[PDB]
Write a protein that binds this ligand. Structure first.
Ligand SMILES: O=C(O)CCCc1cc2cc(Cl)ccc2n1S(=O)(=O)c1ccc2ncsc2c1
Lengths: 256, 247
């Protein structure tokens, strides 16, 4: 290669490294747990009430647990964000805006890593809660996870690994078509670079996968819908469950 | 190889020119002489006001759907798909294409209408009643961003075909051949933008990301269209007219 796509490989390497250091449960660990494996080890499976207890009603602590984890993930993603070259040099206000619109799309992207068609890993991989148990939860909580699984099954079909995902989520943060950005130009120059990095990375890592770059970027449409749909379901849960609390961090991100 | 990709591109451009009366090249020249509609008086002396304007947007959309349908049938492979699947792809595709192509007819201040014989002001449209004042605005906001890419008709012809061959539409029966065709169209689009816009880095990626905005415009637009159902309704003189305009 030439010394320009060489700078692109170094950026890919930097981002992957930051990704490993920022996120405790990688796709590689998640698949080892889900699949096999002598590396890593067996999850306790929650598929019903008694299994849940072996692990204030249940639909609601399950939702409460999920939202605490969300906040947990926002902290991890925010820590990854800082490592993206150029990010912390941007107008502070735009850093906040990029994160605000970025984190949930990233959350559901990385959530796919922890999912198969049958359920999702929980508690850093020590548990596995089935899709059917989640869906059997009560109106409305019953289908708050379903659009996540639907996306995940289609996304996981791309067979990305962590080194791919690391650049992808960086692309997502550095959008610049985000509402209310002050300096779009500096943001777009960064994303242009990241998109180059992602394109080279996918050609090298998935040579036989045609137009993976285009198909992965199209997935960005699925994410936005999940987020939009989740936000609305949340508005509903708030009004019907007036004793349901939301974390102010998530509320602050949700406001608008 | 680049052989089939350039023929694909040329073919779609030719079909695009044939199927769509007003091209972007044509519209851009005019935007830079049309009857301007800035007021009620200009609307009248060039023609329920806000309702006549909405129903005119409907007439135009119905026309556009037929133009898009004809274009689709020109996309190599499209007519060989399961017919249910062709109908599904057009069904969920035309709104996104309608607004994509509408951006060709807009600047930040207004939109061409009636074959470019007219031009309706963004402020006049925005000044309309409720809810008829918020229906066009999000399209102007999309258009301002989309037009920043400065695509031309030969770029758009292929992009439009990419949108039509979306293998993720609900209820598709055989997704494989649809993705197979889109893959080829994506290749052709990538090479087109690389040849036509060498100095514009990652234009292919930027355009694809625009699809997420498209989808949201369409989604929130159909949600306003239901709200319009809770405005005007039962009139036994419409029926045949109402039938012509489904969704
Ligand atoms: O193992 C990990 O790293 C935690 C993996 C994720 C996770 C941990 C967890 C713990 C409990 Cl007690 C309950 C649900 C849990 N989930 S989750 O998948 O349901 C989830 C997470 C984020 C999120 N944001 C919007 S909806 C949503 C749902």
């Amino acid at each position: 290669l030439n010394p320009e796509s060489a700078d692109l490989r170094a950026l890919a390497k930097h981002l992957y490294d930051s990704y490993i250091k920022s996120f405790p449960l990688t796709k590689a660990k998640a698949r080892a747990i889900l699949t096999g494996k002598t590396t890593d080890k067996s999850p306790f499976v929650i598929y019903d009430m008694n299994s849940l207890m072996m692990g204030k009603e249940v639909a609601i602590r399950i939702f409460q647990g999920c939202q605490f984890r969300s906040v947990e993930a926002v902290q991890e993603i925010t820590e990854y964000a800082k490592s993206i070259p150029g990010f912390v040099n941007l107008d502070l206000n735009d850093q906040v805006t990029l994160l605000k619109y970025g984190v949930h799309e990233i959350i559901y992207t990385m959530l796919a890593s922890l999912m198969n068609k049958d359920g999702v890993l929980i508690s850093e991989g020590q548990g596995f809660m089935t899709r059917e148990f989640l869906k059997s939860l009560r109106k409305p909580f019953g289908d708050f996870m379903e659009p996540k699984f639907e996306f995940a099954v289609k996304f996981n079909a791309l067979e990305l690994d962590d080194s791919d995902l690391a650049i992808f989520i960086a692309v997502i943060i550095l959008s610049g078509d985000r509402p209310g950005l002050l300096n779009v130009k500096p943001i777009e120059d960064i994303q242009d670079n990241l998109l180059q990095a992602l394109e080279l990375q996918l050609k090298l890592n998935h040579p036989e996968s045609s137009q993976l770059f285009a198909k992965l970027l199209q997935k960005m449409t699925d994410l936005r819908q999940i987020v939009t749909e989740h936000v609305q379901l949340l508005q509903v849960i708030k009004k019907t469950e007036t004793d349901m609390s939301l974390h102010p961090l998530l509320q602050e991100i949700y406001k608008d």
